[PDB]
Amino acid sequence: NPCCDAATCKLTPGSQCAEGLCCDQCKFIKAGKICRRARGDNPDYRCTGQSGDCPRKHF
Amino acid sequence: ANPCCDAATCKLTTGSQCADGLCCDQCKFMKEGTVCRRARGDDLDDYCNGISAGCPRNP
């Protein structure tokens, strides 16, 4: 994993995230990108620009 | 291989307290008062604090 130092279990320099639908090449995907389509009567889920994790439920 | 770290997620493996460090042994903290640095000059030795993997400079 280029995003993770396996020795220390710390993110490598420049890396913001190690995995996630809102992580691309160790960087956060931009705020607003649709990362999960709603199955029900809900809006779609979008990256926050500040996490590699795509939202799973609306508050 | 680092048994203490899942490099795909950059998370510690199940059961692990630490991944690296002079106060880490087999992914677990060494006990408080373990000597973690034998001073090479005139300072005091440094000691593990029981709850962290690093080796802090003796106050």
Give a short summary of the structure.
Chain A: A motif (Cell attachment site) lies at residues 39-41. The complex is a heterodimer of chains A (59) and B (59). Chain A has 59 residues and is an all-beta fold.
List keywords for this structure.
heterodimer; A: 59 residues; mainly beta; Echistatin; two-stranded antiparallel sheet; two-stranded antiparallel ribbon; B: 59 residues; 6 strands; 0% helix; elongated; Disintegrin acostatin-alpha, processed form (chain A); Disintegrin acostatin-beta (chain B); blood clotting/antitumor protein
How would you sum up this structure, described in words?
The complex is a heterodimer of chains A (59) and B (59). Chain A has 59 residues and is mostly beta strands. Chain A contains no helices and six strands. In chain A, the strands form three sheets. A two-stranded antiparallel sheet of chain A has the order 1-2. In chain A, a hairpin with an 8-residue loop joins β5 and β6. With 59 residues, chain B is mainly beta. Chain B has one domain: Disintegrin domain (Echistatin), CATH 4.10.70.10. At the A-B interface, β2 of A face β1 and β2 of B. The PDB classes it as blood clotting/antitumor protein.
Tell me the structural class of chain A: mainly beta
Tell me, what's the shape of chain B? Answer: elongated
> Which range best describes the helical content of chain B: under 10%, 10-25%, 25-40%, 40-55%, 55-70% or over 70%?
under 10%
CATH architecture of chain A: Irregular
Task: Please identify the oligomeric state.
Answer: heterodimer
What is the helix tally of chain B?
0
- Gross morphology of chain A: elongated
- Tally of helical segments of chain A: 0
Q: Report the CATH C-level class of chain A.
A: Few Secondary Structures
Helix-strand string of chain A? EEEEEE
Strand line-up across the major sheet of chain B: 1-2
Q: Name the CATH superfamily assignment of chain B.
A: Disintegrin domain
